């Protein structure tokens, strides 16, 4: 009867392309209780307000979280020709969403750091003719096709991965490359919230 945000506080948050997604229905939420544990650096919403999203009732609430460096805050905007929205994470444009970038304080010890931040800088299909490239843009609310050939954390900027497709799948290869970003003293996370209005059991407290 209370929406459990606890999982977020345990472990290494995944890199952006492997964002963890908590779906909530029929439960009550205290969003400030969660956010008050971090040092929130940004809190931006689309078609809802920070005050409104903290206090409305929805048919479902969806919370994505990942490791994300504050320095790249700009890349995390729908209007960026950049790789973060092309091949990693892209938020719904048919539902209200908020985007929170936060820094993990020192008493928050159950969140751990990966060795670096990393993301996908290319996820393309190589056709069975072995010459033409077809970028696999990520879709809102989905994972990049390439998430299964890209490691949990990239090891070196520029690493290159590839998977061959069966002939049923059209042959050729699925092909990707990753970028890396120097870790920060304290982990920096992004939280993606997207709410759905339908009949609305997900309510505040």
């Amino acid at each position: 009867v209370e929406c459990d945000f606890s999982p977020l506080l345990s472990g290494t948050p995944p890199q952006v392309y492997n964002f963890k997604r908590l779906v909530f229905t029929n439960c009550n939420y205290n969003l400030t209780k969660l956010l008050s544990l971090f040092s929130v650096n940004d809190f931006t919403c689309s078609q809802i307000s920070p005050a409104a999203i903290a206090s409305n009732c929805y048919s479902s609430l969806i919370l994505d979280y990942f490791s994300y460096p504050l320095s790249m805050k700009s890349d995390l905007s729908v209007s960026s020709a950049g790789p973060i929205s092309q091949f990693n994470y892209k938020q719904s444009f048919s539902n209200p969403t908020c985007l929170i970038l936060a820094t993990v304080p020192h008493n928050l010890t159950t969140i751990t750091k990966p060795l670096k931040y990393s993301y996908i800088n290319k996820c393309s299909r190589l056709l069975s003719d072995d010459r033409t490239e077809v970028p696999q843009l990520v879709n809102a609310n989905q994972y990049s096709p390439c998430v299964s050939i890209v490691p949990s954390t990239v090891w070196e900027d520029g690493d290159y991965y590839r998977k061959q497709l069966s002939p049923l799948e059209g042959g050729g290869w699925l092909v990707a490359s990753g970028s890396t970003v120097a870790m920060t003293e304290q982990l920096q996370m992004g939280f993606g919230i997207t709410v759905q209005y339908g009949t609305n059991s997900v309510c505040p407290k």
Epitope: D130, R131, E133, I149, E156, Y160, R162, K163
Partner: antibody, heavy 124, light 109 residues
Framework: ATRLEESGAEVKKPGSSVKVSCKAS????????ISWVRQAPGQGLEWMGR????????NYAQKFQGRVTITADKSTSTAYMELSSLRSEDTAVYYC?????????????????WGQGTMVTVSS | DVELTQSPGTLSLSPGERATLSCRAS???????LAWYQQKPGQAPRLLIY???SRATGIPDRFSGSGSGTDFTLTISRLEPEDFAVYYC?????????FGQGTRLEIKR
């Protein structure tokens, strides 16, 4: 399966430049991560750079950041290595090398596809 | 670069015995990023092991790798006559990729 055929041995005068070639056959080409490793007689192995044809551009070791130029022609299924300003210690067998199958993590830097080699001699 | 120092420079053993080849590293190397090659006179090297647990296809299961941190090991369960060659380790977690000096394996007559 997929194989790498290199260009014949070749003699070069100190100070000149050599272009060793490496042609692939038996499969495809553009997805491969093709390295160049060289080896001096009686000596161990030395990695020089690598190119992935669709990724466009090569990447080199700092030592050979002059100097060496790795390129690929996706129509010849051929990659090349070029090495300027030769020298009596730059004489060695020059191996063309790659990985087979799918590439996860750093596994394309382990080499289970090798060419026959190319002995490049520098002498007056 | 990272310096990989193999030992002994030459190993003397008879067929049927157990070989232990060492590879020591100047820095720590993740065992995800260490491989071992076999080379025979006049031939390209051939991939054997690329740890932490992979083994190259078509490679005898009597080669296995172990070790972590700084000291790594290529074990050869039972030597067959064709296993007598030069062995090289390789690290590929740090740039640039470095190889080792070589251990030579020869028959103890």
């Amino acid at each position: 399966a997929t194989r790498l055929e290199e260009s014949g041995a070749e003699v070069k005068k100190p100070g000149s430049s050599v272009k060793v070639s490496c042609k692939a056959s038996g499969g495809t080409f553009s997805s491969y991560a093709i390295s160049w490793v060289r080896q001096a007689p009686g000596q161990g192995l030395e990695w020089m750079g690598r190119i992935i044809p669709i990724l466009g551009i090569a990447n080199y070791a700092q030592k050979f950041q002059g100097r060496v130029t790795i390129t690929a022609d996706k129509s010849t299924s051929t990659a090349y290595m070029e090495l300027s300003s030769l020298r009596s210690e730059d004489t060695a067998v020059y191996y063309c090398a790659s990985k087979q199958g799918d590439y996860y993590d750093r596994t394309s830097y382990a080499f289970d596809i090798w060419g026959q080699g190319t002995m490049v001699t520098v002498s007056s | 670069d990272v310096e990989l120092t193999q030992s002994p420079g030459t190993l003397s053993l008879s067929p049927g015995e157990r070989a232990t080849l060492s590879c020591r590293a100047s820095q720590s190397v993740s065992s995800s990023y260490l491989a071992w090659y076999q080379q025979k006179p006049g031939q390209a090297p051939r991939l054997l092991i690329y740890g932490a647990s992979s083994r190259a296809t078509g490679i005898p299961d009597r080669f296995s790798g172990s070790g972590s941190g700084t000291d790594f090991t290529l074990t050869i369960s039972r030597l067959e006559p064709e296993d007598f060659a030069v062995y090289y380790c390789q690290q590929y977690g740090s740039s640039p990729i470095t190889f080792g000096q070589g251990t030579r394996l020869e028959i103890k007559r």
